[model samples]
Target: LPRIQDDLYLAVNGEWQAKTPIPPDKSVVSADSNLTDDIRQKLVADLSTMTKTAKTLPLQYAARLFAKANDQTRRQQLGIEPVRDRISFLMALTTLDQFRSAMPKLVADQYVLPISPYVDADMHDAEHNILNLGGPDTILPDAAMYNQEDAENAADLAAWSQMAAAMLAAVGFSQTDQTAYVEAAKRFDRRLADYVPANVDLAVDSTYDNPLSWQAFEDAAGYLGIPQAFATYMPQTPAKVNAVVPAYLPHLSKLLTPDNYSEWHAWMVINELLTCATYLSDDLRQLAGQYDRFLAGQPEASSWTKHAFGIANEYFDDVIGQYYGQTYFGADAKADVTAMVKQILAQYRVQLENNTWLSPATKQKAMRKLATMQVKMGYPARLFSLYDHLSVDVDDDLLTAILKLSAQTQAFWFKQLGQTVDRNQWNMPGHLVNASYDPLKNDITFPAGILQPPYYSLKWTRAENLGGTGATIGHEISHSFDNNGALYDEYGNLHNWWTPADKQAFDQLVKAMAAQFDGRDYEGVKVNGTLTVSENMADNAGMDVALALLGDQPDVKDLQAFFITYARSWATKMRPERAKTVLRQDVHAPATLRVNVPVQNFPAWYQAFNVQPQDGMYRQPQKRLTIWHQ
Candidate 1:
């Protein structure tokens, strides 16, 4: 039997883990995924069985889209025809001039381009929106993966090529043409790998705050027709556009030339095919997903019903989400969670008030941040007008319906160009099985999908609820002071609000926290502590805030339950390959470390479980780390 003082996670979660089998389509199952599964099942049930009924326009569109996705016969009969002309545009493009001239059409058709322009909060001034430019996709997860002499990367590449060639063949490309395009994509992707920043370098959200004068941006990438496209899409040109991936913006057109037109054309064609693969026939959908499935260690694709629901879920999220929450998540539950969130935020104020290492100015600024931080519970009262702009026909083929929706959604951001940022706008869908802390919005979002058992429950005990969802509530709040969130100030603008000495001291603690997980073995790969520190910091501080909120005096058994529930929330049983991928790329630590690392740092954990030095979970008082002045 696993002991609480030793493997608290296993002790609390082992029974469920042992009894549960990994789902065929998922890489792992956890408390989070368990709840997610329930919500998905609920949605799938309604979507699959429902007849025509009155719902919101977007919800109606969602049902129509779901029905189309479920129509395998129509999809197979339509086969590649829906996307045939789109891909043919790329297949027939013979020169650099032709590629440059076709940018407007490509943008209209939702073709993936070298430089993708989108809108988000302006970095320096959070109250406004700005155009942000991004780079081409890399076949590998990170650019550094291209350099690693690992067989895994090569294996994934082979899988991708297989998927790509299959997609091409399905579109009626000749054997030779399919082979050439696959190789061409590989060659173009290789060029990108040399300049694209690795995921680690891009981990900090603020790093993407590089604003360039419109003139400079135009000079660098205008040849690719980015400026022209932006002008057509956006209502008005701003003074600057944020170069989200600075290293690649200048190299956008440099990577392609008249001599290499064939290679670029092949890449564009392959990407277009892959982008539209899911909307195609069932066989093509499976082929389209093989590369990702191989990477995640998933043995099978999701069920047709599940995938159909998922497609509607992705595009019509706020629509389905608003309906999902209103249908299932009650006002009472929202009120309870909202009350808990308020209580936690109040406790957060005390933690910030007493953080000893921070100077008065910085501490005061932190208070301002806390005071201004917005909490979005359950679901937004309304969906975005983005959906109002969206209209999909149930009678249209899935691709055509999708394209029409895509065009409108893409135009929505452009419409925001001359408008102020609406920070009240939720960054997440109510149906999403997650929570988030958006630094730019200075807000925490708790979608209805996450507001369920294991995370929250009206029937559970106070500690059970606190240990489960209270910690998650704290987790999102604590993110306001995590490594990345610390970069943004009260108004969500990228600014330094720390005194020099306090900044140094906080950075020291940041380094200490990173050291806790750096190079720690999981499967065979070492955890990148630097990459995962932001989340690790949140995990530590989140627990601190939650425990503190429980008050200094509590029943010992309740405390013990609280500790175990915290562990149980993070417990995951993952395939080794998926585990390894998380260690490399994900900002969050592995579930074991996520459970043990933060739990070990708090003295309350030891006291609750009577953890002595001999206990596996014990850490010496002097050795433990805390960022919130615990």
Candidate 2:
């Protein structure tokens, strides 16, 4: 056994770490990953036994889709024919007009590209849909990687280029042409990478919303040739448009010249191959897997079953989720979890009411937000019907089916432009092993998949329930008051609800907490505090809030159970390279700090564990930061 030394994360997790070897296909292993595997296994087992053609349209489509994905031999038989059209389209693009015409269609097919457009709820007015221009795509995980000239970054770039070149070679590009095309691809990525901000910078400035009236939006679009591209794509001109990355638009005209058309064309070719890799033959899939392994340090490709189920899960998420819920979920679980959500919410109200820093005006607004904060337990009351428009052919190639699904979904978004906002709509599927908070809708969702063992179960003790799912519930609710969420009012509009002094005080505490996290270094890699501030704040406040709900239980064993469950819930192990990648890319802190640091800050945690100042994990009581004031 490892020594505790007030380090509860290791105390609880060390044994598991020693016993568990990371599976060859997985880069990291944790509670969440375990649950996901369990969910997949259950789904595969259920899907395996289902009839190939069911009575209902949704179930019938799901059955055929699952069957096709499971049949890898059939996929292999189809060979590269499935992706030949996309490759030919990219290879034929010799002019800027052709490239411009292809952009909307490529986006519709879910191909990777710079400047993908979509319809999303307006930030200021959640009731309406708006046109949003989103990104400058890259094969690398982060835009920051392109700017770094370090050994690892260079190696990653070389690996990326090698893979791109190989993809071109697979599609019959001559060796000389591959070399030229690969260089062009690199420049295309670098151009956009130069303009993009670091993840930390973007996190701090999450919403870069520049609201443009129709005329201004059209002017910019025309400058970038976007209007011409979208002319046939969009159903109607959006009443509102927001340039989410306003800086990316201005550079397009200057950067995308005839000289660089080949570069842009190369980018499109690589992106198209990358997108269609799964639908291509085994060789292309293996080539893509090698690049994945380079990035994450996984030893081998995932099992065919895992790959098949993942595709079916993603393409027809709602249908699969509905089926999974019907077969596996229970009403009792939903009822019990709803009660836990209510308990957490009531505690949040108490915290807000008693908060010393916030005045009556700010506190009142927060309370109102709390009152209106909606909770969705289990699955949605209804699933959107895709049967009306989605037609799945059992005989078609898997890639063809996928492309059809993509096109149908894109059309559905346009159909939603003038429709009223349905607050009941679930953004995620019920089978997903996670919970989320939506600031725009002022809601928290707990899917049926998350309400199982290790996270939540009616069969578990109250202590475990509070520590596991209760803490998750609290974490999401805390997001409403986190840095980004605080900017929105009760109506979910972008309005400041805090007084100037109160806002200043809140910012000071956030900065202090961020500074604490900025110092957390793991094997020469440091966590990005500014990028992860919101999530860190949620973890701290959620633990405190959960403790408050559990308030001095008479049974010491019960209290101990709560703390232990909380600590072990975050147990995780990963390769060092994966850890660095996570630190660079993920907004959440590593699971260890999420447990140990938050526990060290909580006075109740110290009392629970008998942690003293001399212990390695100890922080002086006065020095500990309290993010939530009461």
Candidate 3:
């Protein structure tokens, strides 16, 4: 075996550095690819049709579906939305033949965060892009880590300059255009004049605004196909608060001096609005403009509302079908659905009992955790009863109808404000192809929408499940033990549950993992191992657990099978631009890094591939990072 110290990159950073490779069967997107062309045209057509179709959807019934499509977040660029943006979301839903099971899930969990939750020296460097944007604090925090800028980073600056020059040249932009670009770029230097690093602490404590004083909301209601009212959910009426328009600022007799807090809030609002505009489609912008505060609660009698109602009707049915199929119905037959869920849960429990790393005490504790690990399948059981009270009009004006429905929901929530939490309520609605584990609620959910082929199947081998959604199950379970999770007590309370020695062991393991990729780069940018530690740890842990379980089945062996299986979870091909955008915002490293990191950690991988000291995968003695449960 090679020494771990010398190959510190592999031992410390190896597990998290791999990216998912482009599967040979699919076309890898590039500048010259035709994929985006079709997507762009499809988006344009979808936006145009939503205006016409909004009239036919049941304004209240279809509002749920519309809500799904409204994944375009207003102020944040989180990859975790169901829609790419509002326009694309609507267009895809309206025009696509089949509801994609994976697209929504992909959109919702797009951004990955740091693997571990700790501060590190590399996190403070200007050369790293991980800290460029604000961390999870709602906005950018102070940069106290950066005491002195690295002048050697000039090469990186030059690379940006070169790309700028090339872009200008390609478009036949003249020297004047180039000069203007340079001037604009220079302005950012002055804007970030209060630069500090390490000063602002970024955390994964992992944890949207809008314009239109009131009129904007009303106009958007009709265009988006929402109704004025439905049932008891009440829409809060807009208040005409005294606020000055910027246009009249100079002429004011007495100027209002803004305090620091107010100024920060204003900046955040402006920043959010601009961010929303940049990401939203032109169609969304137009549709949003329909809301007029002057006539918000008013209803209209028109065919336009019919299209809106039609969408709602179709969507309500979709949700119902998903609920029935995922929860009560099964691929073989309806009778087997409940039994299958029980069998799967039982299998998982048995597997947990056999894990070698976990102490017997921990194993028993894990079983108890599993018992309390609430399972909410399909849709909310009470959805139909709630909708029973609302009366639907096929042609009511969309805005008015939306308000009525909102009123019904508001009343429902108000009544339950102090009541005990309903354990059966699902975070994701029916018709969503995704799953989640909420630590606070001590719950795990598998939507009816996501339990089909490519995820779970009656015909698939155990190998297939291990690679697909099985990995996801393992991942969600491991999340309970991540940095944030490690702080949680067995009762699910957020408190320290580990002794100092145990905590130190955990830190050493993660640090070794983080150090593994210290010198590696993705698209020329160095990896921020510290920022991405927790996820990397989870990936490693989940893969290990899944592999062990698979081994006992007599149907799986070696880490490679697990490696390959884990890779399939992210078996997607995206355009280069899409990939680049994700790199900047996403928490997970690219697919290739995802593969390489885990493989290097496995000794079998080195022998199988002949990856020796002369090559990159070899690890030196002092640097190896191992995962052991105490």
Candidate 4:
């Protein structure tokens, strides 16, 4: 066993990481992963029985969708037959005009295209919603992965093309066409990725807020006919539209011109097949997942039962989440976690006051942001308004029912165009085993599903709770002050509030933080510290705020318990394959790096373990990057 003083992560988690095996179907297994799976088991059992009295209409609808998904016999019998006609109709549009004529309806049906548009809160006026036109996802998660300079590009594209070939064959495409279509889509993706920003650059999120005249938007990508599709989501033409992908919009026509019609057409057809593959047969569902599973290095797909429950989540996520919150989530737990968040905020107030580098003006505004920051606990007080339009038809096949529901949802968001943004609205549902900080809302959510067992419970001491859940509270609050969240103000408007010097000071620490993790290797992949700096800063600050509660001197045992609890929260075992993918694109650092890097910065961790300079995990005093002046 490794010495605790030498390496806290390996010392505490080494035995566990050594012994634990990655589950066959799951890419990784950590505390959160286990908790998520546990929650799914309960929901799946409930949906399987689906016989309780006085169920909500959404749940009733969910139950019907779940049944459709679980009916392996019916799904097998109806295999490919349900979506094949749709595919055939789409593929039959050999002419660009025919494809263009069908494009608006296809977009209405939630089909993927070179250009994607949707409605969301206006960034400048967080009070109201508006149209946002965005571009397609890259073939590989990172745009850089498409470059030949990237060692993984060829292999990744090859694996994806193999999956495309396999699925297209099922839909009756000839071998020649399968190879051609896959190549065409890849070429289109490569072109699109050239303009799409990299994941790391997304931390500077204000770039997505390019508000332009609606006419310019139409002119910018007139080849896309996006206005025709946007009209379906909103009635009157807005004077302006938000160019969510400003860089990509200008290249839209160049990428989708008459010369590349076959590429765009083939890409759309591939998208349709990939999108509908899961709704067909059990075999097709597994086939559809081949590429993703390959990327994640999971040997198999999730249980059909859990996959079936997702059919419910697509339309009725809030309904099932509401059911889970009301039935299993405790009121006492919600109140306790809320109180814990309140405690962290009280401590954070002092940290901002003590921050040495921030100017008076920036610090004052930072204080105001903290004061106004909202804490949303447990389940949402309200749910979405789309239930009236969402339904599961007994006469319709599963794919048909889902398509209708998708169309109905696309139609439903137009209703929000003129409405004020509900600041209290939950960005994540109560049943999700995750926490978040939405910069636009200037708020944090601690869902019902996350406030249990290892994270927080009556069973653990307050110290343990502080380490696990308390740190999480601080993490979300710290996000308001991190590199990304700091870009927005208290009211959630994207504005620069910091003095230039103060901003430069913070960037110095940001640069150092990125270097700390940049070249750290995980599973044969180098971690992109720039991509993960925001979250890493939050993790560091989270520990500082939580440690502040323990005071300058504390009982050694309690200190060990707190630090260990924090370290144990991040104990994870992931497949090397998934670890490589996550290292490249995930905003969060690898789990081991998350624990080892953040905890080492705090003096409390050193005191708890009596770490020395000679210890492998030790950080020299001046070398530490402690945020919030801890």
Best by lDDT: 1
lDDT of 3 by residue, 1-630 (tens): 223323422443234334534332222422112222332233323333443344323323454434323433421233213123432332233211212222332223221111001111111121111101121221112232123456423433344344443333333446775455434443332233233123212235422001123343333222212212211122343221111112111211111122222222222222222233222333322222222111121122222222232334332543433333444436462223334445445655766665555545445655665676666655555553334545344444333344355445434543432233444445565445556666556566666555555455556555556555565566566666666556554455555556566567667777876676554566555566666666677666655555545443343243344444445444344434334334434446555566566656655445434567776655554555546422
Q: After superposition, how far is residue 326 of candidate 2 from its true place, in Å?
A: 2.7
Model 1 misplacement above 4 A? 48-51
Displacement of the residue 172 alpha carbon in candidate 2, Å:
1.3
Give lDDT per model, in order. Answer: 0.83, 0.77, 0.41, 0.82
Order of models, best TM-score first = 1, 4, 2, 3
Per-prediction TM-score: 0.97, 0.95, 0.52, 0.96
Model 3 regions lying over 4 Å from their true place: 1-60, 63-203, 206-367, 378-416, 516-520, 552-562, 574-581, 603-630
The better candidate by TM-score, 2 or 4, is: 4
Which ranges of candidate 4 are over 4 A from the true structure?
Answer: 51-54, 149-151
lDDT of 2 by residue, 92-125 (tens): 7787767666666655567655566677677788
lDDT for residue 80 in candidate 4, whole number 0-100: 89
Q: Candidate 3's error at 480, in angstroms?
A: 1.3
Residues 160-263, model 4: lDDT tens digits: 89989988999888999999999998888888888888776765676687898878877876556667777666767777778776688877778877777888
Report the C-alpha displacement of residue 609, candidate 3, in angstroms.
Answer: 7.1
